[PDB]
Amino acid sequence: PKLVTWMNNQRVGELTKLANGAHTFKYAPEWLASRYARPLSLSLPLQRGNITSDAVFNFFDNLLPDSPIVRDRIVKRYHAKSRQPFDLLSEIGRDSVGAVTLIPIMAWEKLTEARLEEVLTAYKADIPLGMIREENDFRISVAGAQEKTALLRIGNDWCIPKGITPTTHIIKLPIQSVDNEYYCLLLAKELGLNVPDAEIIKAGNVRALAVERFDRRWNAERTVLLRLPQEDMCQTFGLPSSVKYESDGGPGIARIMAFLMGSSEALKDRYDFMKFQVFQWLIGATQGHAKNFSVFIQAGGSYRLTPFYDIISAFPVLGGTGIHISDLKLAMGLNASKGKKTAIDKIYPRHFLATAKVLRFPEVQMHEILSDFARMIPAALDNVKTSLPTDFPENVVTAVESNVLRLHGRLSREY
Numbered sequence: 538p539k540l541v542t543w544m545n546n547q548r549v550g551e552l553t554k555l556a557n558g559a560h561t562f563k564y565a566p567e568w569l570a571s572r573y574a575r576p577l578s579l580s581l582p583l584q585r586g587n588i589t590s591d592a593v594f595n596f597f598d599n600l601l602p603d604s605p606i607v608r609d610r611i612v613k614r615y616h617a618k619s620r621q622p623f624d625l626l627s628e629i630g631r632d633s634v635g636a637v638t639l640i641p642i643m644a645w646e647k648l649t650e651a652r653l654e655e656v657l658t659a660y661k662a663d664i665p666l667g668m669i670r671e672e673n674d675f676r677i678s679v680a681g682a683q684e685k686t687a688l689l690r691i692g693n694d695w696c697i698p699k700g701i702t703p704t705t706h707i708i709k710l711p712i713q714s715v716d717n718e719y720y721c722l723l724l725a726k727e728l729g730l731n732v733p734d735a736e737i738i739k740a741g742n743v744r745a746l747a748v749e750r751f752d753r754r755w756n757a758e759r760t761v762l763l764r765l766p767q768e769d770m771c772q773t774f775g776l777p778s779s780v781k782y783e784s785d786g787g788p789g790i791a792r793i794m795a796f797l798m799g800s801s802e803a804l805k806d807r808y809d810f811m812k813f814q815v816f817q818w819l820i821g822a823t824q825g826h827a828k829n830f831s832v833f834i835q836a837g838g839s840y841r842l843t844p845f846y847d848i849i850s851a852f853p854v855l856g857g858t859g860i861h862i863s864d865l866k867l868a869m870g871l872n873a874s875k876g877k878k879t880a881i882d883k884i885y886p887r888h889f890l891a892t893a894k895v896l897r898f899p900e901v902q903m904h905e906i907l908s909d910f911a912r913m914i915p916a917a918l919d920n921v922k923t924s925l926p927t928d929f930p931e932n933v934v935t936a937v938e939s940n941v942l943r944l945h946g947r948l949s950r951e952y
């Protein structure tokens with residue numbers, strides 16, 4: 538049938554699946570006439586009538602977990618009509634990344650430590666996104682291939698939101714990734730990068746990562762929780778999650794930098810994006826694909842980059858399973874004298890400078906970024922280390938700082 542699409546308390550339009558299986562979307566005239574109307578996606582510009590392009594199917598598919606296995610679980614959990622996005626979202630689309638609420642204001646159930654552990658380990662019983670069969674009003678969806686869930690934090694209590702109430706945190710579970718990401722987010726923050734705050738939460742013998750959502754915002758008085766429109770780069774370019782990597786045809790640095798020229802914060806966003814490329818290289822982050830970058834869609838359809846997220850270093854995984862440093866590749870390659878430069882172990886300042894030059898990113902700014910990491914990295918690693926718990930896995934810290942300092946040496950010798 539039909540899924541009515543809401544942005545907070547406003548009707549945006551409807552998603553329908555035709556008798557031919559095609560996914561179509563139509564904006565409500567009331568939405569189109571609203572003062573600050575904005576599109577669901579920059580790939581789905583405001584217009585009247587049914588939109589039938591592949592961009593519709595892809596946009597909504599990108600709201601679901603990437604893994605075909607996780608999708609199998611959802612189907613089995615809610616006896617979904619099929620595996621298509623419309624049918625899976627009919628079941629779990631009330632709360633997803635961004636502000637799209639799909640249904641065919643503030644209510645919740647507080648969780649006890651015992652119940653919290655139940656949700657956080659439900660995946661062991663083939664439960665998708667911690668949506669235990671016990672509940673029936675816990676419908677959430679979150680993209681990405683890593684096992685996770687999402688919860689509502691009210692004060693210092695964890696809660697399962699009911700109906701259309703939003704979640705406030707994305708909870709990532711162990712597939713040592715929890716400690717890895719925790720460390721990387723702290724290092725990012727220490728270096729002045731825009732990333733969300735996160736904390737390691739405990740529930741029995743379970744250790745998960747609770748990441749504060751930047752697609753959610755409480756009003757000043759903390760009485761109402763709103764969702765903020767947001768989409769990832771696959772969505773913004775109308776592409777399927779299957780091509781998130783540049784090697785599979787997804788957007789690279791050049792395409793995203795050109796797209797950011799249209800940002801309401803273009804110069805800042807371009808600078809921050811290039812800075813983050815140098816950061817990913819330094820920490821051996823190999824999964825900076827298109828779905829790991831997003832933009833907020835603002836009133837009137839303007840857009841701006843969101844904070845960076847899903848930051849994992851490959852360094853702690855080296856050697857243990859035979860992966861060598863020479864095997865680490867940036868998801869989005871840099872310019873090389875000939876072709877591209879992708880090997881973290883072979884990249885130097887010259888590659889960032891050559892890339893900036895061809896992309897019209899000021900050379901002075903690129904030097905600034907490189908020189909800033911050259912003098913700040915040592916102190917940043919130390920400061921983070923001192924901020925880590927005492928039970929934090931020392932091997933993670935060792936693997937990351939030794940490998941970061943090794944690459945950092947390349948910057949300090951130049952700057």
Ligand SMILES: Nc1ncnc2c1ncn2[C@@H]1O[C@H](COP(=O)(O)OP(=O)(O)OP(=O)(O)O)[C@@H](O)[C@H]1O
Nearest residue numbers: 634680681682683733748749750751752828846847
């Ligand atoms: N703090 C946040 N606030 C808002 N949205 C977020 C936040 N962190 C992640 N997201 C969104 O949720 C998705 C899943 O998170 P994340 O990228 O961290 O997952 P993964 O690490 O599960 O992903 P992958 O599939 O690459 O392994 C992202 O693609 C992004 O759209």
Ligand SMILES: [Mg+2]
Nearest residue numbers: 681828829847
């Ligand atoms: Mg991701």
Ligand SMILES: [Mg+2]
Nearest residue numbers: 683824847849
């Ligand atoms: Mg990831």
